[PDB]
PDB file of C-alpha atoms and ligand atoms in Angstrom:
ATOM      1  CA  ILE A   1      25.999  30.561 -66.289  1.00 24.18           C
ATOM      2  CA  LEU A   2      23.969  30.736 -63.038  1.00 27.50           C
ATOM      3  CA  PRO A   3      23.257  27.599 -60.960  1.00 27.82           C
ATOM      4  CA  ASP A   4      19.962  25.892 -61.748  1.00 24.49           C
ATOM      5  CA  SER A   5      19.240  25.622 -57.999  1.00 24.72           C
ATOM      6  CA  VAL A   6      20.572  27.364 -54.891  1.00 23.71           C
ATOM      7  CA  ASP A   7      20.014  26.676 -51.193  1.00 26.26           C
ATOM      8  CA  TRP A   8      22.109  28.783 -48.823  1.00 24.46           C
ATOM      9  CA  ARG A   9      21.212  26.442 -45.939  1.00 25.18           C
ATOM     10  CA  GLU A  10      23.723  24.063 -47.542  1.00 27.84           C
ATOM     11  CA  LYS A  11      26.492  26.595 -46.789  1.00 26.30           C
ATOM     12  CA  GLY A  12      25.427  27.049 -43.159  1.00 26.27           C
ATOM     13  CA  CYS A  13      24.392  30.654 -43.852  1.00 25.92           C
ATOM     14  CA  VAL A  14      20.814  30.520 -42.508  1.00 25.68           C
ATOM     15  CA  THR A  15      19.838  30.602 -38.839  1.00 28.27           C
ATOM     16  CA  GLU A  16      16.944  28.723 -37.279  1.00 31.85           C
ATOM     17  CA  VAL A  17      13.440  29.800 -38.314  1.00 30.83           C
ATOM     18  CA  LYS A  18      11.996  32.316 -35.810  1.00 30.09           C
ATOM     19  CA  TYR A  19       8.429  32.885 -34.548  1.00 33.09           C
ATOM     20  CA  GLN A  20       7.165  36.480 -34.784  1.00 34.18           C
ATOM     21  CA  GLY A  21       3.881  35.862 -32.976  1.00 32.20           C
ATOM     22  CA  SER A  22       1.311  38.643 -32.842  1.00 27.16           C
ATOM     23  CA  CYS A  23       3.957  41.354 -33.469  1.00 27.60           C
ATOM     24  CA  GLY A  24       4.070  42.436 -37.128  1.00 26.71           C
ATOM     25  CA  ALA A  25       7.874  42.372 -37.274  1.00 26.54           C
ATOM     26  CA  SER A  26       8.443  40.222 -40.372  1.00 23.10           C
ATOM     27  CA  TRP A  27      10.351  43.188 -41.849  1.00 26.45           C
ATOM     28  CA  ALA A  28      12.790  42.947 -38.937  1.00 29.93           C
ATOM     29  CA  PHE A  29      13.187  39.172 -39.255  1.00 32.02           C
ATOM     30  CA  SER A  30      13.755  39.489 -43.009  1.00 35.69           C
ATOM     31  CA  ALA A  31      16.457  42.119 -42.439  1.00 38.23           C
ATOM     32  CA  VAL A  32      18.434  40.234 -39.771  1.00 35.15           C
ATOM     33  CA  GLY A  33      18.088  37.068 -41.833  1.00 38.93           C
ATOM     34  CA  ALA A  34      19.814  38.644 -44.817  1.00 37.52           C
ATOM     35  CA  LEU A  35      22.572  40.138 -42.665  1.00 39.26           C
ATOM     36  CA  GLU A  36      23.120  36.841 -40.799  1.00 41.61           C
ATOM     37  CA  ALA A  37      24.200  35.231 -44.079  1.00 40.65           C
ATOM     38  CA  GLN A  38      26.638  38.016 -44.947  1.00 42.15           C
ATOM     39  CA  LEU A  39      28.103  37.802 -41.437  1.00 41.26           C
ATOM     40  CA  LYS A  40      28.563  34.050 -41.783  1.00 41.30           C
ATOM     41  CA  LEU A  41      30.305  34.429 -45.153  1.00 40.45           C
ATOM     42  CA  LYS A  42      32.685  37.079 -43.778  1.00 40.14           C
ATOM     43  CA  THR A  43      33.484  35.627 -40.340  1.00 40.53           C
ATOM     44  CA  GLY A  44      32.640  31.907 -40.525  1.00 38.74           C
ATOM     45  CA  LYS A  45      30.233  32.330 -37.599  1.00 41.39           C
ATOM     46  CA  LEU A  46      26.461  31.790 -37.784  1.00 38.57           C
ATOM     47  CA  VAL A  47      24.774  34.047 -35.186  1.00 38.36           C
ATOM     48  CA  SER A  48      21.104  35.007 -34.879  1.00 36.28           C
ATOM     49  CA  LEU A  49      20.836  38.797 -34.866  1.00 35.56           C
ATOM     50  CA  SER A  50      18.390  40.820 -32.776  1.00 36.90           C
ATOM     51  CA  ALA A  51      15.153  41.453 -34.605  1.00 36.60           C
ATOM     52  CA  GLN A  52      14.007  43.096 -31.351  1.00 39.73           C
ATOM     53  CA  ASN A  53      16.845  45.605 -31.706  1.00 38.56           C
ATOM     54  CA  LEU A  54      15.274  46.672 -35.021  1.00 36.23           C
ATOM     55  CA  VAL A  55      11.710  46.803 -33.640  1.00 36.49           C
ATOM     56  CA  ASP A  56      12.714  48.996 -30.688  1.00 33.50           C
ATOM     57  CA  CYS A  57      15.367  51.204 -32.299  1.00 33.28           C
ATOM     58  CA  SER A  58      14.774  51.467 -36.066  1.00 34.45           C
ATOM     59  CA  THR A  59      11.601  53.477 -35.581  1.00 34.04           C
ATOM     60  CA  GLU A  60      10.095  56.824 -36.654  1.00 34.20           C
ATOM     61  CA  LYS A  61      13.336  58.192 -38.149  1.00 31.53           C
ATOM     62  CA  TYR A  62      13.384  55.133 -40.445  1.00 30.84           C
ATOM     63  CA  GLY A  63       9.675  55.181 -41.288  1.00 32.81           C
ATOM     64  CA  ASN A  64       9.179  52.039 -39.218  1.00 35.23           C
ATOM     65  CA  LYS A  65       6.369  51.303 -36.775  1.00 36.07           C
ATOM     66  CA  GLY A  66       7.729  48.352 -34.758  1.00 32.74           C
ATOM     67  CA  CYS A  67       5.080  45.657 -34.308  1.00 30.91           C
ATOM     68  CA  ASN A  68       2.904  47.587 -36.772  1.00 30.22           C
ATOM     69  CA  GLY A  69       5.246  47.132 -39.748  1.00 32.83           C
ATOM     70  CA  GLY A  70       8.372  48.452 -41.388  1.00 32.60           C
ATOM     71  CA  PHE A  71      10.904  48.166 -44.209  1.00 31.93           C
ATOM     72  CA  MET A  72      14.019  46.028 -44.581  1.00 29.44           C
ATOM     73  CA  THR A  73      15.916  48.784 -46.400  1.00 29.31           C
ATOM     74  CA  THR A  74      15.489  51.323 -43.607  1.00 31.28           C
ATOM     75  CA  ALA A  75      16.311  48.585 -41.105  1.00 31.39           C
ATOM     76  CA  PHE A  76      19.645  48.152 -42.916  1.00 30.98           C
ATOM     77  CA  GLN A  77      20.099  51.935 -42.872  1.00 36.27           C
ATOM     78  CA  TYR A  78      19.639  51.989 -39.088  1.00 37.56           C
ATOM     79  CA  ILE A  79      22.308  49.287 -38.708  1.00 35.79           C
ATOM     80  CA  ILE A  80      24.612  51.376 -40.905  1.00 37.13           C
ATOM     81  CA  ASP A  81      23.832  54.591 -38.997  1.00 35.04           C
ATOM     82  CA  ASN A  82      23.966  52.863 -35.585  1.00 34.30           C
ATOM     83  CA  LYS A  83      27.319  51.227 -36.439  1.00 33.60           C
ATOM     84  CA  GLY A  84      26.030  47.867 -35.260  1.00 30.89           C
ATOM     85  CA  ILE A  85      23.268  45.498 -34.284  1.00 31.65           C
ATOM     86  CA  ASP A  86      23.203  43.313 -31.170  1.00 29.20           C
ATOM     87  CA  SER A  87      22.968  39.545 -31.136  1.00 28.88           C
ATOM     88  CA  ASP A  88      19.580  37.999 -30.474  1.00 28.17           C
ATOM     89  CA  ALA A  89      21.236  36.310 -27.482  1.00 25.79           C
ATOM     90  CA  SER A  90      21.953  39.689 -25.861  1.00 26.75           C
ATOM     91  CA  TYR A  91      18.747  41.382 -27.064  1.00 28.71           C
ATOM     92  CA  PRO A  92      16.104  38.650 -27.343  1.00 29.20           C
ATOM     93  CA  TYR A  93      12.763  38.825 -29.117  1.00 32.83           C
ATOM     94  CA  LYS A  94       9.643  39.630 -27.092  1.00 34.93           C
ATOM     95  CA  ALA A  95       7.013  40.263 -29.812  1.00 34.92           C
ATOM     96  CA  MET A  96       6.276  43.663 -28.248  1.00 33.23           C
ATOM     97  CA  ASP A  97       7.250  47.282 -28.777  1.00 32.16           C
ATOM     98  CA  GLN A  98       9.906  48.298 -26.248  1.00 30.06           C
ATOM     99  CA  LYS A  99      12.216  51.202 -25.544  1.00 32.67           C
ATOM    100  CA  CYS A 100      15.424  51.019 -27.556  1.00 34.51           C
ATOM    101  CA  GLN A 101      17.975  49.062 -25.515  1.00 37.75           C
ATOM    102  CA  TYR A 102      20.867  48.800 -27.996  1.00 40.88           C
ATOM    103  CA  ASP A 103      24.217  48.205 -26.290  1.00 40.95           C
ATOM    104  CA  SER A 104      27.381  48.402 -28.400  1.00 42.69           C
ATOM    105  CA  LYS A 105      29.032  46.046 -25.896  1.00 43.54           C
ATOM    106  CA  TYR A 106      26.999  43.205 -27.446  1.00 40.28           C
ATOM    107  CA  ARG A 107      27.375  44.198 -31.110  1.00 40.00           C
ATOM    108  CA  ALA A 108      27.387  41.031 -33.210  1.00 42.36           C
ATOM    109  CA  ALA A 109      27.328  42.557 -36.705  1.00 41.67           C
ATOM    110  CA  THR A 110      27.703  45.736 -38.712  1.00 40.06           C
ATOM    111  CA  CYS A 111      26.332  46.790 -42.085  1.00 41.86           C
ATOM    112  CA  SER A 112      28.295  48.712 -44.703  1.00 41.34           C
ATOM    113  CA  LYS A 113      25.695  49.147 -47.438  1.00 39.99           C
ATOM    114  CA  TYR A 114      22.555  47.692 -48.959  1.00 39.08           C
ATOM    115  CA  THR A 115      21.365  47.328 -52.528  1.00 37.55           C
ATOM    116  CA  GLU A 116      17.832  47.436 -53.924  1.00 36.36           C
ATOM    117  CA  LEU A 117      16.865  45.340 -56.940  1.00 33.66           C
ATOM    118  CA  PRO A 118      14.536  46.484 -59.743  1.00 35.33           C
ATOM    119  CA  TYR A 119      10.820  45.787 -59.274  1.00 34.45           C
ATOM    120  CA  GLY A 120       9.522  42.554 -60.797  1.00 33.93           C
ATOM    121  CA  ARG A 121      12.834  41.368 -62.288  1.00 28.88           C
ATOM    122  CA  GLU A 122      12.939  37.723 -61.264  1.00 27.07           C
ATOM    123  CA  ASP A 123      16.018  37.185 -63.436  1.00 27.25           C
ATOM    124  CA  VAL A 124      17.849  39.916 -61.507  1.00 28.05           C
ATOM    125  CA  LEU A 125      16.664  38.383 -58.213  1.00 27.67           C
ATOM    126  CA  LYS A 126      17.959  34.975 -59.306  1.00 27.65           C
ATOM    127  CA  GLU A 127      21.373  36.447 -60.056  1.00 29.35           C
ATOM    128  CA  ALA A 128      21.556  38.186 -56.664  1.00 33.52           C
ATOM    129  CA  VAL A 129      20.552  35.044 -54.734  1.00 33.09           C
ATOM    130  CA  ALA A 130      23.186  33.047 -56.641  1.00 31.85           C
ATOM    131  CA  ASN A 131      25.964  35.655 -56.519  1.00 32.05           C
ATOM    132  CA  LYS A 132      25.370  37.665 -53.328  1.00 32.05           C
ATOM    133  CA  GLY A 133      23.368  35.563 -50.859  1.00 30.75           C
ATOM    134  CA  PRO A 134      19.886  35.443 -49.330  1.00 30.23           C
ATOM    135  CA  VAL A 135      17.793  38.453 -50.411  1.00 32.75           C
ATOM    136  CA  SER A 136      15.194  40.257 -48.298  1.00 33.59           C
ATOM    137  CA  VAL A 137      11.846  40.550 -50.110  1.00 34.22           C
ATOM    138  CA  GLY A 138       8.202  41.283 -49.424  1.00 33.61           C
ATOM    139  CA  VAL A 139       5.343  39.042 -50.533  1.00 32.70           C
ATOM    140  CA  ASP A 140       1.579  39.330 -50.609  1.00 34.76           C
ATOM    141  CA  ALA A 141       0.703  36.945 -47.771  1.00 28.30           C
ATOM    142  CA  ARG A 142      -2.927  38.105 -47.348  1.00 27.61           C
ATOM    143  CA  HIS A 143      -4.483  34.833 -48.421  1.00 28.71           C
ATOM    144  CA  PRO A 144      -5.791  31.901 -46.364  1.00 27.33           C
ATOM    145  CA  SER A 145      -3.850  29.607 -48.704  1.00 26.29           C
ATOM    146  CA  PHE A 146      -0.630  31.208 -47.478  1.00 24.92           C
ATOM    147  CA  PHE A 147      -1.425  30.550 -43.797  1.00 27.21           C
ATOM    148  CA  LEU A 148      -2.626  27.030 -44.732  1.00 27.22           C
ATOM    149  CA  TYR A 149       0.392  26.154 -46.914  1.00 27.21           C
ATOM    150  CA  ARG A 150       1.941  22.766 -46.100  1.00 27.48           C
ATOM    151  CA  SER A 151       4.234  21.623 -48.937  1.00 25.03           C
ATOM    152  CA  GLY A 152       5.108  21.855 -52.625  1.00 26.17           C
ATOM    153  CA  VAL A 153       5.309  24.879 -54.889  1.00 29.45           C
ATOM    154  CA  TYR A 154       2.816  27.498 -53.705  1.00 31.65           C
ATOM    155  CA  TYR A 155       0.674  29.180 -56.388  1.00 28.82           C
ATOM    156  CA  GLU A 156      -2.201  31.510 -55.428  1.00 26.77           C
ATOM    157  CA  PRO A 157      -4.289  32.718 -58.408  1.00 25.97           C
ATOM    158  CA  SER A 158      -5.613  35.739 -56.501  1.00 26.90           C
ATOM    159  CA  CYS A 159      -2.171  36.892 -55.348  1.00 27.93           C
ATOM    160  CA  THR A 160      -1.139  40.457 -56.212  1.00 24.93           C
ATOM    161  CA  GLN A 161       2.227  42.182 -56.583  1.00 27.12           C
ATOM    162  CA  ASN A 162       1.498  44.434 -53.555  1.00 26.43           C
ATOM    163  CA  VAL A 163       3.678  43.133 -50.715  1.00 27.28           C
ATOM    164  CA  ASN A 164       2.695  43.161 -47.075  1.00 27.80           C
ATOM    165  CA  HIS A 165       4.901  40.547 -45.332  1.00 26.49           C
ATOM    166  CA  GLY A 166       8.707  40.502 -45.188  1.00 28.19           C
ATOM    167  CA  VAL A 167      10.478  37.186 -45.847  1.00 31.06           C
ATOM    168  CA  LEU A 168      13.918  35.917 -46.914  1.00 31.86           C
ATOM    169  CA  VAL A 169      14.729  34.237 -50.236  1.00 31.86           C
ATOM    170  CA  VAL A 170      17.480  31.753 -49.338  1.00 30.76           C
ATOM    171  CA  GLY A 171      17.486  29.945 -52.686  1.00 29.61           C
ATOM    172  CA  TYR A 172      15.546  28.717 -55.685  1.00 30.42           C
ATOM    173  CA  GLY A 173      14.960  25.546 -57.628  1.00 33.73           C
ATOM    174  CA  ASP A 174      12.490  23.383 -59.503  1.00 35.07           C
ATOM    175  CA  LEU A 175      10.157  20.604 -58.363  1.00 35.78           C
ATOM    176  CA  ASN A 176       8.670  18.308 -61.031  1.00 37.52           C
ATOM    177  CA  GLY A 177       8.861  21.069 -63.606  1.00 36.57           C
ATOM    178  CA  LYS A 178       7.617  23.895 -61.381  1.00 36.89           C
ATOM    179  CA  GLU A 179      10.210  26.572 -60.647  1.00 35.36           C
ATOM    180  CA  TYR A 180      10.178  28.031 -57.165  1.00 33.60           C
ATOM    181  CA  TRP A 181      11.770  30.490 -54.781  1.00 31.05           C
ATOM    182  CA  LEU A 182      12.960  29.002 -51.474  1.00 31.60           C
ATOM    183  CA  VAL A 183      11.540  31.346 -48.838  1.00 31.03           C
ATOM    184  CA  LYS A 184      12.378  31.464 -45.127  1.00 34.19           C
ATOM    185  CA  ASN A 185       9.340  32.631 -43.146  1.00 34.96           C
ATOM    186  CA  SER A 186       9.157  33.828 -39.507  1.00 36.46           C
ATOM    187  CA  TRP A 187       6.151  31.783 -38.351  1.00 36.00           C
ATOM    188  CA  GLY A 188       8.114  28.996 -36.595  1.00 37.23           C
ATOM    189  CA  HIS A 189       8.761  25.376 -37.607  1.00 39.34           C
ATOM    190  CA  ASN A 190       5.109  24.384 -37.870  1.00 37.04           C
ATOM    191  CA  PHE A 191       4.473  26.639 -40.874  1.00 36.18           C
ATOM    192  CA  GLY A 192       4.899  25.066 -44.310  1.00 36.02           C
ATOM    193  CA  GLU A 193       8.021  22.932 -44.864  1.00 37.77           C
ATOM    194  CA  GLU A 194       9.793  23.337 -41.508  1.00 40.47           C
ATOM    195  CA  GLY A 195       9.130  27.077 -41.634  1.00 41.41           C
ATOM    196  CA  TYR A 196       9.893  27.519 -45.348  1.00 40.98           C
ATOM    197  CA  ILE A 197       7.595  28.045 -48.317  1.00 42.58           C
ATOM    198  CA  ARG A 198       8.518  27.290 -51.909  1.00 44.19           C
ATOM    199  CA  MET A 199       6.818  29.994 -53.972  1.00 44.93           C
ATOM    200  CA  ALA A 200       6.187  29.987 -57.733  1.00 44.41           C
ATOM    201  CA  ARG A 201       9.109  31.463 -59.687  1.00 44.71           C
ATOM    202  CA  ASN A 202       8.998  33.008 -63.186  1.00 45.43           C
ATOM    203  CA  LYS A 203       5.213  33.287 -63.027  1.00 42.92           C
ATOM    204  CA  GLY A 204       4.957  37.052 -63.531  1.00 41.97           C
ATOM    205  CA  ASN A 205       6.257  38.228 -60.151  1.00 40.71           C
ATOM    206  CA  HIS A 206       3.899  35.913 -58.268  1.00 40.83           C
ATOM    207  CA  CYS A 207       2.725  37.370 -54.928  1.00 41.85           C
ATOM    208  CA  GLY A 208       5.139  40.277 -55.541  1.00 43.17           C
ATOM    209  CA  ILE A 209       8.177  38.212 -54.553  1.00 41.95           C
ATOM    210  CA  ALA A 210      10.444  40.396 -56.741  1.00 41.77           C
ATOM    211  CA  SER A 211       8.611  43.700 -56.150  1.00 39.95           C
ATOM    212  CA  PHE A 212      11.016  45.071 -53.499  1.00 39.06           C
ATOM    213  CA  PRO A 213      14.151  42.956 -53.007  1.00 38.78           C
ATOM    214  CA  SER A 214      17.182  44.239 -51.139  1.00 40.22           C
ATOM    215  CA  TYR A 215      20.297  42.830 -49.510  1.00 40.71           C
ATOM    216  CA  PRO A 216      23.014  44.195 -47.210  1.00 40.82           C
ATOM    217  CA  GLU A 217      26.769  43.694 -47.301  1.00 41.57           C
ATOM    218  CA  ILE A 218      29.578  43.815 -44.720  1.00 42.80           C
ATOM    219  CA  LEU A 219      32.744  45.092 -46.383  1.00 45.47           C
ATOM    220  CA  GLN A 220      36.350  44.459 -45.404  1.00 43.78           C
ATOM    221  CA  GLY A 221      37.368  47.125 -42.933  1.00 42.18           C
TER     222      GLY A 221
HETATM  223  C1  LIG B 301       3.661  49.840 -42.577  1.00 41.57           C
HETATM  224  C2  LIG B 301       5.105  50.076 -42.861  1.00 41.57           C
HETATM  225  C3  LIG B 301       5.778  51.047 -41.920  1.00 41.57           C
HETATM  226  C4  LIG B 301       5.778  49.489 -43.856  1.00 41.57           C
HETATM  227  C5  LIG B 301       5.266  48.534 -44.854  1.00 41.57           C
HETATM  228  O1  LIG B 301       4.202  48.684 -45.474  1.00 41.57           O
HETATM  229  N1  LIG B 301       6.053  47.473 -45.053  1.00 41.57           N
HETATM  230  C6  LIG B 301       5.713  46.434 -46.026  1.00 41.57           C
HETATM  231  C7  LIG B 301       6.760  46.464 -47.116  1.00 41.57           C
HETATM  232  C8  LIG B 301       6.826  47.554 -47.977  1.00 41.57           C
HETATM  233  C9  LIG B 301       7.783  47.625 -48.981  1.00 41.57           C
HETATM  234  C10 LIG B 301       7.810  48.797 -49.876  1.00 41.57           C
HETATM  235  N2  LIG B 301       8.978  49.322 -50.246  1.00 41.57           N
HETATM  236  N3  LIG B 301       8.629  50.366 -51.065  1.00 41.57           N
HETATM  237  C11 LIG B 301       9.674  51.184 -51.657  1.00 41.57           C
HETATM  238  C12 LIG B 301       9.911  52.466 -50.871  1.00 41.57           C
HETATM  239  C13 LIG B 301      10.229  52.221 -49.407  1.00 41.57           C
HETATM  240  N4  LIG B 301      10.840  53.372 -48.730  1.00 41.57           N
HETATM  241  C14 LIG B 301       9.831  54.376 -48.408  1.00 41.57           C
HETATM  242  C15 LIG B 301      11.516  52.949 -47.514  1.00 41.57           C
HETATM  243  C16 LIG B 301       7.291  50.483 -51.189  1.00 41.57           C
HETATM  244  C17 LIG B 301       6.724  49.507 -50.451  1.00 41.57           C
HETATM  245  C18 LIG B 301       5.241  49.331 -50.363  1.00 41.57           C
HETATM  246  N5  LIG B 301       4.654  49.964 -51.524  1.00 41.57           N
HETATM  247  C19 LIG B 301       3.841  49.288 -52.351  1.00 41.57           C
HETATM  248  O2  LIG B 301       3.560  48.114 -52.151  1.00 41.57           O
HETATM  249  C20 LIG B 301       3.287  50.032 -53.548  1.00 41.57           C
HETATM  250  C21 LIG B 301       1.760  50.079 -53.650  1.00 41.57           C
HETATM  251  C22 LIG B 301       1.116  50.168 -52.286  1.00 41.57           C
HETATM  252  C23 LIG B 301      -0.401  50.146 -52.347  1.00 41.57           C
HETATM  253  N6  LIG B 301      -0.892  50.457 -53.737  1.00 41.57           N
HETATM  254  C24 LIG B 301      -0.176  51.603 -54.323  1.00 41.57           C
HETATM  255  C25 LIG B 301       1.291  51.277 -54.507  1.00 41.57           C
HETATM  256  C26 LIG B 301       5.048  51.372 -51.698  1.00 41.57           C
HETATM  257  C27 LIG B 301       6.543  51.501 -51.993  1.00 41.57           C
HETATM  258  C28 LIG B 301       8.689  46.583 -49.127  1.00 41.57           C
HETATM  259  C29 LIG B 301       8.640  45.494 -48.278  1.00 41.57           C
HETATM  260  C30 LIG B 301       7.692  45.417 -47.268  1.00 41.57           C
HETATM  261  C31 LIG B 301       7.668  44.206 -46.375  1.00 41.57           C
HETATM  262  F1  LIG B 301       8.629  43.338 -46.662  1.00 41.57           F
HETATM  263  F2  LIG B 301       7.821  44.488 -45.119  1.00 41.57           F
HETATM  264  F3  LIG B 301       6.532  43.523 -46.499  1.00 41.57           F
END
């Protein structure tokens, strides 16, 4: 009963691709990316949320290490605990570790909960992308082919299921008989297909795309 193909960009739920630079904050970009879609669905407004807010404030208590890495799930937990996250406009991205400067005056979103999906279940991931929205995931990006990707459905024979880079699944589809996940990266427009990579789908959890998926929600109230 699920759609054969999904692309949440078609519903105006995905902000512009960002550029993380030399700061290892893909976990933070993946987290705000997922929440940006839920905020758009609830309020009608598409607003980039502050990845920097996560880097500076969702730190040791959440197991995160700022520009040295982190988790989307504990980023969501911080937003829940903190009762908000600032807009990127008010708290812009500097690709550096800074003191926490969260200001509730510029809160642009909240988070009520988040859900984790079972490891390696690409069918379950498909259902969530179709029925809930863009899903935060990790992938194994430690391959020159990933950095060098330009177009088409990416398949890396030496990929593993051990994730190391946070990204956002904003959809899925098929290209000339190859199924793919539509993945928003945080390496700017010049990476891949305008900042996106289409990654092999239903090929045994390729590059760990379904190893650790999660997504937040903003509930009425
Ligand atoms: C340096 C740092 C602070 C964080 C980090 O590494 N982030 C990368 C990252 C990690 C995870 C992640 N989630 N889980 C669930 C439990 C998580 N709790 C504890 C919160 C885990 C991981 C990583 N993992 C594994 O891969 C398992 C294997 C790791 C190396 N062989 C042995 C097992 C452990 C459990 C998911 C997404 C991302 C993403 F997207 F950012 F790439």
